[PDB]
Amino acid sequence: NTSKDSTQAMIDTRYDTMANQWLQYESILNKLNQQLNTVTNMINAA
Amino acid sequence: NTSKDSTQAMIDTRYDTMANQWLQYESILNKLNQQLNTVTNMINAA
Amino acid sequence: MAFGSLSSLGFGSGVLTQDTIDKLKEAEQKA
Amino acid sequence: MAFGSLSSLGFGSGVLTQDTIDKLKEAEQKA
Amino acid sequence: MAFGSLSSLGFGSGVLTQDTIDKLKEAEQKA
Amino acid sequence: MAFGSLSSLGFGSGVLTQDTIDKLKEAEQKA
Structure with a gap:
């Protein structure tokens, strides 16, 4: 049980950072989508 | 010509930042792809 | 794994249907 | 969820077949 | 025309590429 | 534009062919 729990910890250790990465690029693609909409707002405006 | 050049400046102004965003998410997706390969390297190793 | 890679990151790929609403x-309900 | 979105609203997507008729x-019958 | 109809209303169907940015x-520039 | 959005960011979508090599x-050559 002890060894299994150790490896279990290691398992979610990776995927937690991966979740952080997912939300990270969610924010980045929100920045780029909002900025594409921003240049599109300038395209429509300017 | 002057006014046209002003708006021309405004044009590339947006797309320069957009290029920065593109390389930005290139780096972020490189981080996530390398980290997916990292958790995959742990999956294969561990 | 030297080529282990993925192409994109996506969302919302598809069309709304009442069936999706039911799902x-x-x-x-479960959660 | 900031990007949680769907693209369209659709119907009738497809072609009639006797199999669909049977379904x-x-x-x-059930209902 | 009795069947003249369309299935859906859509947007954003696709993936961003630098080529689309150029377009x-x-x-x-034109407009 | 409230829905003006794109789904993904992608690369390398496709298969190599000698035709692509020629392109x-x-x-x-041009550049």
Whole structure:
């Protein structure tokens, strides 16, 4: 049980950072989508 | 010509930042792809 | 793994249908 | 969820087949 | 025309590419 | 524009062919 729990910890250790990465690029693609909409707002405006 | 050049400046102004965003998410997706390969390297190793 | 890679990151790929609504309702009910 | 979105609203996507007719018949029978 | 109809209403169908960025830049330049 | 959005960011979508090689060669030649 002890060894299994150790490896279990290691398992979610990776995927937690991966979740952080997912939300990270969610924010980045929100920045780029909002900025594409921003240049599109300038395209429509300017 | 002057006014046209002003708006021309405004044009590339947006797309320069957009290029920065593109390389930005290139780096972020490189981080996530390398980290997916990292958790995959742990999956294969561990 | 030297080529282990993925192409994109996506969302919302598809079209709304009442069936999808029902699936979401079931998931919510469960959780 | 900031990007949680769907693209369209659709209907009738597809082609009629006797198999679909049979499925509808079964659904009606049930209900 | 009794069957003249369309299935859906859609947007954003696709993936961003620098090529699309260039096309948008050209369109803006024109207009 | 409230829905003006794109789904993904992608690369390398496709398969190599000698034709693509020729196209790249032409582009390089030009530039």
